């Protein structure tokens, strides 16, 4: 078995500037294509207190924030502020008229509801109404921050499909709105409601600033950087195909596609109901429905892009059924896209290698296991001077289908690059390539949208 160690994938920033790191790259070069007077209007929903808190946090961010760990300065950088060293080259301002409060009485009405599902539906009802109003009115926000007070986050979010997820239901009920929402804890400003809370929740402030502003920038529709391609002519598109299961009806599974470009922008499609192998498990598409989904996805891509891709790579976390490979082949053939690849990305392989020492293997370590490719998307990171995690990383196993045009070395480098498309943080060592990571996020939302109802393809609404 032959091993490689891939270079950290390079990103491209303003004026053709390159860097491996989003944060250093933005400070050196700015974002990919700024325009003079760029401004992101930020609407806010909160209480009197949390709205004031957000104002102060934005002002503090604008001045700049010192690193809280100078011994690892690349992983924990200073936030350079929003003045003459603004790395986004973009203002972030809450316009007057674009803030909506939640009253004390409304907080108490939600927390006072004893049944969890009742409380969640009441909260979603109220907030989705407030969002619709803010979008419908004259304030014209590009993105909205929802800063709920801590006792309301404690009611709505469990600590660590029986029960409603507040965030997933809210996103579903607001999926028709064009202005995305960022839901935050009002003390530290990191993301709330995406994962369970810690019962004893109790520096990294500059990192929190970087991350929130990067999230708002993506949600406003601006692009901080692109994956640097091998050829400036050879555009590649990356299509993930996923499935989610409905809780109501017959609990049928529905296919989804997550179609990404090299600028990290995603298009979300819902396709046909899936078939299942055994007792309602192991979802898969028939040849006809796999063809239809890939045709739908290619169509959406073409509608949103100038150039047709020279290569399309299809990623799925379960093996390609012969019928899926058949239908994908049929859609590709008819598309006239020149090159195409199908890769099964195993997220739970038991296979691993172990160097001798306390640090794990480098990120970008790849082992070709006779037509299977073991890839460490997490591991020791030279740029950061550490392994940023604690538990040992477990690699991906990539299994290219025989129908693929590219080598397993090319496809592994593509997967590693796709891990840098990241709407959640500015730290680049993420485990999953964006199209696969997108599947689970979009599935949790779309199970709350009735099958057959049209859904927006704009991925920002799902983040």
């Amino acid at each position: 078995f032959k091993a490689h160690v891939f270079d950290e994938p390079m990103l491209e920033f303003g004026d053709g500037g390159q860097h491996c790191d989003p944060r250093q790259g933005l400070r050196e070069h700015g974002p990919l294509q700024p325009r003079s007077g760029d401004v992101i209007r930020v609407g806010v929903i909160g209480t009197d207190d949390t709205v004031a808190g957000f104002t102060e946090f934005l002002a503090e961010t604008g001045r700049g924030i010192e690193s809280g760990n100078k011994q690892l300065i690349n992983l924990n950088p200073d936030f350079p502020g929003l003045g003459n060293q603004n790395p986004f080259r973009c203002k972030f301002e809450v316009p007057d008229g674009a803030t909506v409060t939640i009253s004390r009485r409304q907080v108490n009405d939600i927390t006072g509801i004893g049944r969890h599902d009742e409380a969640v539906r009441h909260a979603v009802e109220l907030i989705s109404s407030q969002l619709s109003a803010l979008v419908e009115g004259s304030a014209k926000p590009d993105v909205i921050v929802l800063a709920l007070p801590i006792p309301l986050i404690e009611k709505l979010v469990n600590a660590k499909g029986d029960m409603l997820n507040f965030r997933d239901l809210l996103k579903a009920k607001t999926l028709h709105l064009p202005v995305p929402t960022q839901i935050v804890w009002p003390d530290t400003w990191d993301d709330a409601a995406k994962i369970p809370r810690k019962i004893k929740r109790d520096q990294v402030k500059a990192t929190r600033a970087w991350n929130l502003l990067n999230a708002l920038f993506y949600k406003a529709g601006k692009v901080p950087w692109r994956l640097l391609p091998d050829q400036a002519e050879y555009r590649t598109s990356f299509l993930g195909i996923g499935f989610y299961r409905d809780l109501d009806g017959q609990q049928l599974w529905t296919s989804t596609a997550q179609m990404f470009d090299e600028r990290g922008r995603g298009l979300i499609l819902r396709g046909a109901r899936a078939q299942t192998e055994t007792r309602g498990r192991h979802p898969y598409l028939t040849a006809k429905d796999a063809e239809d989904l890939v045709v739908q996805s290619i169509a959406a891509y073409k509608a949103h892009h100038r150039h047709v891709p020279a290569r399309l790579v299809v990623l799925k976390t379960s093996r390609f059924r012969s019928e899926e490979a058949e239908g994908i082949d049929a859609a590709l053939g008819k598309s006239g896209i020149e090159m195409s690849d199908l890769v099964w990305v195993q997220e739970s392989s038991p296979i691993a290698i172990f160097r001798d020492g306390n640090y794990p293997v480098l990120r970008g370590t790849f082992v070709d296991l006779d037509g299977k490719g073991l890839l460490y998307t997490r591991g020791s990171v030279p740029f950061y001077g550490t392994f940023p995690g604690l538990r040992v990383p477990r690699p991906l196993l990539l299994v290219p289908h025989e129908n693929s045009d590219s080598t397993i070395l090319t496809l592994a480098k593509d997967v590693l690059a796709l891990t840098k498309v990241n709407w959640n943080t500015t730290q680049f060592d993420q485990k999953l390539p964006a199209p696969i990571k997108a599947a689970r996020e979009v599935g949790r939302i779309l199970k709350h949208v009735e099958f057959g109802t049209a859904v927006s393809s704009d991925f920002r609404r799902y983040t």
Binding site: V5, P77, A352, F354, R355, D356, V361, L362, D370, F383
Partner: protein, 275 residues
Amino acid sequence: SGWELQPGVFLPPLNKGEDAIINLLRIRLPDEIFISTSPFGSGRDAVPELVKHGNVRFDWVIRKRRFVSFFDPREYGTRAIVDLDQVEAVDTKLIAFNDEQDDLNDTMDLLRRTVERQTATQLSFLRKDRLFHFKAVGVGKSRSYRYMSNVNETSAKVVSAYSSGYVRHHAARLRFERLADEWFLVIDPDFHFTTDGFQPHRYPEALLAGKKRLERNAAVRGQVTMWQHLLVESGKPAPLLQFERLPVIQLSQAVPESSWNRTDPRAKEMEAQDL
């Protein structure tokens, strides 16, 4: 003046490279395999008939009225659970190395059951989680396992009892992976908890959280090493399966661990602390 721009400098990996071990063992299968039809749909259905005879063994598979085993089923109580007129010895390649999902699944089940029988002196098997764990001997009693790590003799407390009560057993998921035209066993270490060496612990989740503290590179690598010894030694009526370590994986660039041990304020966190 203002916020300093860092140069974005860092210590690169060492160009001298280093080695790593992979958690696979090559499996050497017998050259022939026995197949037959059975009156029984599945293996569970055949058990009551099987146990009417002596010298019972369970390293065999019956699925969809088809039997497979590496041993000759005519010479054991399995002669009661097969159609005897259909028993044949065939090239193992014809079951273990084809494209049929059904033969692939039956091969893996047979491998798993063969390993269970071959390792029963040290290990117990849990159907839940498909977990193989070192078995206790004695209630609330610890025990150790000696094994070779390269040229050095070492040992681990593979059953570890604690009282103020629980017992931790070294465990592994042993999986099977076919790469090209060879079968491999994959070692994925874990721990199993019991109350007293035997009775499964009534609520793992308390203890599940302590396992994570132990998932660190040197500790997992040591456990791989120990299982490879157990399984290789298990293959030495002869055992039906032999196992072979693979040559080390050579990496062209090495983690700069000795520098980082100096510079990285988090270096000590990379090492497991057994509480």
